[PDB]
Each structure stands twice: as C-alpha cells, then as structure tokens.
Amino acid sequence: GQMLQDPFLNALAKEHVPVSIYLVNGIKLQGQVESFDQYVVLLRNTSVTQMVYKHAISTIVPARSVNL
Amino acid sequence: GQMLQDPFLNALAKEHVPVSIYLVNGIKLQGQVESFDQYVVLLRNTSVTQMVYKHAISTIVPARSVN
Amino acid sequence: GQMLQDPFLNALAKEHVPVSIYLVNGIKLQGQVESFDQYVVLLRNTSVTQMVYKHAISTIVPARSVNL
Amino acid sequence: GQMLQDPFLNALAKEHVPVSIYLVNGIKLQGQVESFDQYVVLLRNTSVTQMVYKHAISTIVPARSVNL
Amino acid sequence: GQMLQDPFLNALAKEHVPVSIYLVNGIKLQGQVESFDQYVVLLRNTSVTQMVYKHAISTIVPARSVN
Amino acid sequence: GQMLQDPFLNALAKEHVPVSIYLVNGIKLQGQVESFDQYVVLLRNTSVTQMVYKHAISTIVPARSVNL
C-alpha cells in the first residue's frame, strides 16, 4: 500500500479516539493523539501533553477501529 | 533479491492468512494483515485494527506459507 | 501534521520547563532542555549538562503543558 | 570493504546452508535463507517461511563458512 | 538549534573531560573521547581505544560541564 | 572528525587484532574482523565466519589499540 500511517493518525487526532501506545521499553501510554508530524506523536492524558518519538512506538491500539 | 517484502505482505493480506507478528520488546501480536505502507502494518484482531511500526517488527510468521 | 517536534522542544528550551525524558533502556532523566539539534537534546540537571541522543528517547513528559 | 552483505546472503540462499539468526530480542531462529531483499530475509524451517526484518537481526551464524 | 552535537563532542575531546557513555543495553563506558565521526565515537580507557556506535549511545555524561 | 570508522575496521581486518564485539542484546562475540562493508562486519572465530549487522553493534573493543 501507500500512505496509510497518516490517514490512521489523522483519524485518531480528529476523532479523539482513546489509544494505547506500546513503546519498545514495554511502557504502555494511554490518552488521545493531539497531533503528530514526521517523527513524533503528541499524546494527551488527564494531566499533560507528552511528546512520543515514533522510533520508540511498537504499536498503536485504538479503543475502536478508525475508518480511512 | 529485489522487492520480496511487499509481495510477501500482499500475499498475506489478499489470501487472509493468520499471522504472528513478533515485536522487538517480545510482544507477540496475532491476526490478519489488513494493509501496509512504507513504515506500518495494519493488523486486525477480534476487536480492532492496530497500527504496527515495521521498525518494531522482528519477524512475521504465517500460520501457513504464502505464494 | 508538519514540524511539531521543534516548536515543542523550543518551548521547553526557552521556558525552561522541567521535563522527564524516558530512554529506550528504561532510564528516566530529569532536568531542563538547554538546547537541541537534528540528533541530540542537551539536558541540564543540578550538576551537569548531558548530551542525549534522540534515537534513545521514547517520550518527553513536561511538568506542565507547553503551547506551540 | 564494499558489498560483502549480499554475496554472503546469496551464498546462503543458493547453497541452502543451515543458519542460526540471532535477533535483537535474544530470539534465535533456525532454518535456511530462501531469499532476501533490501530490508528482509525469508527464512524457511520444517513448517513455514517467515519474513525476518534485517533491522532486528544481530548476527547470522552459518553451520559452515561460505566462500564469497 | 543547529549543529550542537559536534561542538559538544569536540569540547570533550579537546578539553580531555572524563565522560560516562550509557549504551541502550545498560552498559556504562568510561574514559576520554579521543575522536568521533558521522557514526562512531572513539573512547579511550586505561588499556585501549574502543569504537562505540552512536546508534547504541543513549546519553553522554561529562564529569564536568563543557564550553 | 571525518571517516574514523573505516580506518579503525581496516586496521582490525589487516592486522587481525583480536576483538570483542558487544551487541545491543548483551551478547559478546569474540574473534577477528575478516572484512566489513557499509552495513556488516564478518567476524571469524575458531569454527566459523558469522555476519554481524553494524546496527546491532554497541562497541568494538580490541585486545590492543590500532593506530590509524
């Protein structure tokens, strides 16, 4: 395929779908995708927006499927 | 060889072969390859389609071999 | 989106917001972002400025959210 | 040197030499190299051909040395 | 910023500042930065100069801050 | 600096200096550098020549310093 990553992240950011972001160090982050660019995802929880490097993301698991 | 990755992923997706995706953190994901692009594989389980970064994939083990 | 990484790091560096930098090896660094470039972040604690490779950063968690 | 990787993998694939492929997660795969490209190695065991990402390979140890 | 990595490594090498180099596998290396290029740092201990791949470096912690 | 990696590996390969190659998975390989290219190092022990991906190498520690 071509260009599935961005439609997927765009859907998460616009629809505010709850996600679980699994990092290569075993940490699981939870919140909503605020925004993203070439290298990072901005993830907002109850307290803070944190900057997650895509290079450290293994998988992003939405609470429900997004349609692209 | 040249361009074996995409034929492999395409065969999995079009023939709906169940796979095991082993990640660099030891997690094993299971389901169907829905689609893929330069950097990600969309993997569907019982519940949802999740986005897996290729950079975190160690190996993809199909339930049966593809053509 | 496009070019969210640098506005985020710029805000941290100019406003000196305390951060927690989680590395791929599970180490958690704490201090303030002094400066950054394509590949590294300079993080200052009470004692020293250390040079952190972005490739080893999983997430950067500010003590409070920055506006970009 | 220049372009030793491909002659090495070509010898394994054409001569079907048994290999042990050590991954960055400590997993050890065993079988024969079926084929390879820029990013992946196709490794066949008794049951199945699996697709191994080179980025996850630490070392490939043949059962005997190949000449290139 | 732009091009802070090399000034940092150059200061360590020219001022002979002892460093701790933490690797992604948890190993901590100690000694002097001898030299560096696009991909590696040459680190000298008691005995030898070893070649460290930047891709395996998490952080470099100097014994004292550089200018 | 510029182009220190190859002079270092060339010295190891031509002078056959015993090395210890530490991998990101904690494995320590021992032997001599046979050859190398952009992406791999061919390391020979008593039994076999194995192909090591540079991306999985943390550090290469020679038994004695090489002069470049």
The two three-digit tokens of residue B50, written as one number: 């999740």
Give dist(CA E47, CA E49) in Å, integer. 7
Specify the resolution in Å.
1.7
Kindly state the tokens that stand for C56. Answer: 């080893």
Can you name the residues that pair with B29 across neighbouring β-strands? B21
The answer to whether the Cβ–Cβ distance between D55 and B55 falls below 8 Å is yes
Q: If DSSP codes are grouped into helix, strand and coil, which group holds residue C66? A: coil
Phi first, then psi: what are they for D37, rounded to 5°? -145, -160
- B9 in Cβ contact with B64 (< 8 Å): no
Where is E67: in which H helix or E strand? Answer: none
Helical segments of F1-68, H only: 5-15
Q: Which residue of E has its CA nearest to F24?
A: E25
At E29, phi and psi to the nearest 5? Answer: -95, 145
Residue C67 near chain A (CB below 8 Å): no
In angstroms, the CA F36 to CA D12 distance is: 17
Determine how β-strand F28-36 pairs with β-strand C57-62: unpaired
Phi, psi of A29 (to 5 degrees): -95, 145
Q: Which of C32, C40, C41 is the best substitution to test chain E (most E C-beta atoms within 10 A)?
A: C40
Task: Please report, for chain D, the start and end positions of each structural domain, with discontinuous segments joined by +.
Answer: 1-68
**Chain-chain contact of B61 with D39 (C-beta, under 8 angstroms):** no
E25/C27 Cβ within 8 A: no
Q: How far apart are CA F28 and CA F36, in angstroms?
A: 18
Question: Across the interface, do A25 and B23 touch by the CB < 8 Å criterion?
Answer: no
Most E CBs within 10 A among F2, F4, F36, F67, hence the mutation to make, goes to F4
Q: In chain F, which residue's Cα lies nearest the Cα of D23?
A: F25
How many whole angstroms separate alpha carbon A43 and alpha carbon A34? 6
Distances (CA, A) of C54 to A1, B16, E36, E58: 29, 38, 18, 8
Residues E49, E31: Cα–Cα separation, whole Å = 9
Name residue F16's amino acid.
H
D66 in contact with B at a CB cutoff of 8 Å?
Answer: no
Question: Measuring CA to CA, which residue among B36, A42, A15 is closest to residue C1?
Answer: A42
Cβ contacts of B54 on chain D, cutoff 8 Å? 39, 53, 55
Subunits close to B (at least 3 CB pairs below 8 A): A, D
Using DSSP, state whether D52 is helix, strand or coil. strand
Are B40 and A5 within 8 A, CB to CB? yes
CA distance linking residue C30 with residue C10, whole number of Å: 17
How close is the nearest chain B Cα to the Cα of D64, in Å?
Answer: 22
Give one word for C16, left, alpha or beta, with left for phi > 0 and alpha for psi -120 to 50.
left
Nearest CB among A23, A37, A50 relative to C60 is that of: A50
How far is F10 from F8, CA to CA, in rounded Å?
A: 6
Length in residues, chain D: 68
Looking at the complex, report in whole angstroms how far the Cα of residue B39 sits from the nearest Cα belonging to chain A. Answer: 7
Residues 6+ apart with CB under 8 A from A14: none
Q: Which residue of B has its CA nearest to A4?
A: B37
Inter-chain contacts counted by CB atoms under 8 A, chains A and B: 64
Residue C63 identity = A
Q: For residue C59, what are the contacts with CB-CB under 8 A and spacing of at least 6?
A: A23, A27, A29, A43, A50, A51, A52, A53, A56, C21, C22
Contacts of B37 (CB under 8 A, 6+ apart): A1, A2, A3, A4, A5
CA F40 to chain centre: 9
F9 contact partners, CB below 8 Å, separation of at least 6 = E51, F33, F36, F41
Looking at beta carbons, which residues of chain B come within 8 Å of D51? 5, 8-9, 59-60
User: How far from D48 is each of B64, B66, C59, D42, F7, CA to CA, in Å?
Assistant: 6, 9, 37, 10, 42
Q: Please give the sequence-ordered ranges of beta strands (E in DSSP) within chain C, or none if there are none.
A: 18-23, 28-36, 40-44, 49-53, 57-62
**If you count them, how many residues does chain C have?**
68
Q: How many CA atoms lie within 13 A of B13 on its CB side?
A: 15
User: Which of E40, E17, E43, E12 shows the shortest CA–CA distance to E29?
Assistant: E43
Tell me if E50 and F61 make a contact (CB, 8 A cut-off): yes
H or E stretch covering E29: strand E28-36
Give phi and psi for A2, each to the nearest 5: -140, 130
Report CA torsion sign: F40, F41, F43, F49.
positive
H/E stretch holding F37 reads none
